[PDB]
Design a protein around this ligand. Sequence first.
Ligand SMILES: NC(=O)[C@H]1CCCN(C(=O)Cc2ccccc2CO)C1
Ligand SMILES: [Zn+2]
Length: 139
Amino acid sequence: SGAIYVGNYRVVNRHLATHNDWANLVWEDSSRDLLVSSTTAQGCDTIARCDCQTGVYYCSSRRKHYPVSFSKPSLIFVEASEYYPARYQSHLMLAVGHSEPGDCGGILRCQHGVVGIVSTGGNGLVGFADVRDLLWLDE
Ligand SMILES: NC(=O)[C@H]1CCCN(C(=O)Cc2ccccc2CO)C1
Ligand SMILES: [Zn+2]
């Protein structure tokens, strides 16, 4: 679990969005596993606007942060789950690191701010849904 709070927006994994997220929907994209909802309070986070390929992510299943080298956002095949059929997920970045079911929503950060959130994993890999291209989050 986990979310990004920037301005009057809450960014979460689309497959973990609540009834309240859907009732306050701003934008969602199944192909990216992202959903953004509106909030009444101002948020705590800053979004990175960079091309970093190293950062640190929070892994809830270890209660720890880990440094990672991650690939550029791209279209990657993701096996079927209870949430989605087998499909290509876009704007996804992979890295070697621990993740298991439950870790989605953990933030990935570089020195410039929030880069994205955990969205996939398995067999010593962790995938992150990029948010750096969503320029409207800051206005
Ligand atoms: N974006 C998606 O389609 C995801 C929807 C939820 C399931 N999913 C995973 O990758 C789960 C997973 C399995 C094994 C280790 C780690 C994880 C990530 O927590 C795919
Ligand atoms: Zn950066």
